Amino acid sequence: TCPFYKKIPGTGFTVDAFQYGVVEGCTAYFLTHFHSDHYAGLSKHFTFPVYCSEITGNLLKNKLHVQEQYIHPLPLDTECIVNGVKVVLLDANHCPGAVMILFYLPNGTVILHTGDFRADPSMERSLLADQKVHMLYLDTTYCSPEYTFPSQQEVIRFAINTAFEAVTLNPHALVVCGTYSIGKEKVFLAIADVLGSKVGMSQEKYKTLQCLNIPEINSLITTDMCSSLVHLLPMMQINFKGLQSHLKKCGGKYNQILAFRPTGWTHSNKFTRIADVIPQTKGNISIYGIPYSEHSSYLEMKRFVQWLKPQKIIPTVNVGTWKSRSTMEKYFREWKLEAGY
């Protein structure tokens, strides 16, 4: 059964609620983004209205085969009326097509649902600047002060410089990047661009990237592996055995692999700085774990919430244990007392 934190009270709306069968009284199902834990349950047999971004709608149509008649794409930054209720979609700074949703309830209450997001000061000059938000449904993935990591720009600078140095020293080196979902496309696109290469990948991954429908990505991707010196593989293959196996298939074209595993936060962030990061190495294979996050750091989250000044916060991540729930509630109270309430 559908949990309380996925229902929007005083409406017929749910958010990211496709794995619970027919939800009683739900007239419209919102989907914040195309990640599997959020879309779980959608297929060609779904017959209720789905509201989402254009990019999310492209993925629903082509990857999950949802019928066109049930897909309702909405433009960003635009007041829209859905089943008698004013809504706005805002960029979430997560993966491609990811949104936050502002709901203007009939009773005068205003709700912001962040979906998954990476909070940024630029959100302080969105349509959020205008008015009061009563309730915030918050992506609390990294809601603890130990969760630190660098900016996306700093991580990409490291990856570009590392890859360019390696291939300039050894023109016969291959670069490999791991993936298991949409998001983090900058890692492989930025490396390919500096090396003057397209990114080679499976037909299935090519299809997914096409669905994003953006010319710059299309110009840098191919299914012809032999023509490319940056290859994408499933994240599960980014290990010494998997990479050894892959190098055999390349027909003596390469004699070294440099590989990148984009992760989220890992405990090595507590000790090491991005500039001091070193790889795991075995013979002619090296693997770098790089902390490229598409979720807010603790400090980014705190800044956003202290700016927004919501009356109530409902966490949507780490909700399963009493320890997690208690810890998050203590941070929200600290932030409030500091902020002057």
Ligand X SMILES: Oc1c(F)cc(F)cc1-c1cc[nH]n1
**Residues in touch with ligand X (CB under 6 A):** 96, 185-186, 189, 214, 216-217, 305-306, 309-313, 322-323, 326-327, 332, 335-336, 339, 341
Would you call 327 exposed, middle or buried from its count of C-beta atoms within 10 A (0-12, 13-18, 19+)? middle
**271/322 with CB nearer ligand X:** 322
Choice between 139 and 185, CB closer to ligand X: 185
Q: CB–CB of 177/231 below 8 Å?
A: yes
Q: Which does 15 bind (CB under 5 to 8 A by kind): Ni ion, ligand X, none?
A: none
Size of the site for Ni ion (CB under 5 A): 2
The packing angle between helices 185-195 and 152-169, to 10°, is 40
| Closest to 297 measured CA to CA, from 265, 329, 336 | 265
Question: Which of the listed partners (Ni ion, ligand X, none) does 35 bind, with a CB threshold of 5 to 8 Å by partner kind?
Answer: Ni ion
Shortest distance, position 15 Cβ to ligand X, whole Å: 20
In whole angstroms, the minimum distance from the beta carbon of 46 to ligand X comes to 25
Neighbours of 316 (CB within 10 A): 21
Instruction: Provide, rounded to whole angstroms, the least separation between the CB of residue 45 and Ni ion.
Output: 24
116 binds Ni ion (CB under 5 A): yes
Write the CA distances from 41 to 226, 278, 296, integer angstroms: 37, 40, 27
Binding partner of 116, given ligand X, Ni ion, none, CB within 5-8 angstroms per partner class = Ni ion
- CA 103 from centroid of its chain's CA atoms: 22
Cβ-based nearer residue to Ni ion, 37 or 79: 37
Rule CB under 5 A: is residue 139 a binding residue for Ni ion?
A: no
**Nearest distance, CB of residue 339 and ligand X, angstroms:** 4
Q: How far apart are CA 6 and CA 208, in angstroms?
A: 27
